[PDB]
Each structure stands twice: as structure tokens, then as C-alpha cells.
Ligand binder design. Structure first.
Ligand code: HEM
Ligand code: NA
Length: 151
């Protein structure tokens, strides 16, 4: 739904994520789990990590963040043509992990906050708008697949 110009801002900012994917992943998950503690309960792997120092010390959580941001980066680089990338993600998050669509909204907010905190200069108003639109499109298409799956 984005313009080419907006996609360029999305991908330009994502290149900075890729310069420290693991660090971005940790910051995003710490923000998600501290702001929305109920999400922490859906991560059986991590629900025992109840302090910020405890999540930061978890190499398992650090590895998961890379997995997550690697999949998200692959989706964003498709500039909306991400049917095949979203299919297995919707399938697992709807029917295996049982993640409400609202939690993807919480994670999207956390991504935006971390990008702004690490890259306040490059993640200005226009890049923030483009990245919000890209994540909104991701959530819309995931929600449509949830419905196809019966969830
Ligand atoms: C922000 C967008 C998100 C992306 C891109 C993403 C991506 C992924 C990927 C690639 C996996 C591993 C493969 C798979 O099982 O499908 C995974 C696993 C998982 N995700 Fe997500 N995810 C997101 C949001 C969330 C949210 C919000 C929750 C719940 C709070 C969640 C909970 C889980 C759980 C429980 C697993 C299984 C992990 C395990 O125990 O090994 N995800 N995700
Ligand atoms: Na579970």
C-alpha cells in the first residue's frame, strides 16, 4: 500500500537494524515484555525472565530476536509481495503459539520505539510514517491469514 519512496525509507532504516540485529532484537523484546507483561506469558521459553537484567543476560532470548528480525526483514524487503513469507508465520502464530493479533501490534510499537531510540536522526517523521505503514500492512495481511486458518 506504500509508495516506492516510502519503501526506500523502510529498507534504508532496516539496513541499520542489520548492523546489529541481535542488539535490536534484545531491545525490542525487553520493551515488549516490560510494557506488556501478558506477552511474556505467551513465550514459555522466556516467561521466567521477569527483570530487564534477566532478559538482557539470556543468550537464548538474544538468539530468538535474531530469528524474529531476520524473518521480519525478509518480509519487508518484499515491499508488500510477501504472501509466501507470511504463510508459515501466520500458521504457527495462530495455531501453534496462539498469539493474538493485538500482540503483533504491541511488538510493532516496540520496533518503532527501538528504531527511534537507536537512530533518532535517520528515523525521522517520514521514516517513522513509512515504517508504521509497513508494519500495519504486515499485521493486516497476517490477520487475514488468521481468518483463513479459523482463528
Ligand atoms: C513482531 C512480529 C513477529 C515475528 C516476525 C515473529 C517471528 C517468529 C519466527 C520466525 C518464529 C520461529 C518460527 C515460527 O515458529 O514461526 C517465531 C516463534 C515464536 N513466536 Fe513470534 N514473531 C512475532 C511476534 C510474536 C509475538 C507478539 C509473540 C507473542 C508474544 C510471539 C510468540 C512466539 C512464540 C511463542 C514462538 C515459538 C518460539 C519457541 O518457543 O521456540 N511472536 N516467531
Ligand atoms: Na504456548
Amino acid at each position: 500500500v506504500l509508495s516506492e519512496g516510502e519503501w526506500q525509507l523502510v529498507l534504508h532504516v532496516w539496513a541499520k537494524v542489520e548492523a546489529d540485529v541481535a542488539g535490536h532484537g534484545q531491545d525490542i523484546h525487553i520493551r515488549l515484555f516490560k510494557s506488556h507483561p501478558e506477552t511474556l506469558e505467551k513465550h514459555d521459553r522466556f516467561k521466567h525472565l521477569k527483570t530487564e537484567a534477566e532478559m538482557k543476560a539470556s543468550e537464548d532470548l538474544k538468539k530468538h530476536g535474531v530469528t524474529v528480525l531476520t524473518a521480519l526483514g525478509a518480509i519487508l524487503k518484499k515491499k508488500g509481495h510477501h504472501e509466501a513469507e507470511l504463510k508459515p508465520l501466520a500458521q504457527s502464530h495462530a495455531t501453534k503459539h496462539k498469539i493474538p493479533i493485538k500482540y503483533l501490534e504491541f511488538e510493532s510499537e516496540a520496533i518503532i520505539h527501538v528504531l527511534h531510540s537507536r537512530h533518532p536522526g535517520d528515523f525521522g517523521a517520514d521514516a517513522q510514517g513509512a515504517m508504521n505503514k509497513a508494519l500495519e500492512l504486515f499485521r493486516k495481511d497476517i490477520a487475514a491469514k488468521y481468518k483463513e486458518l479459523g482463528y
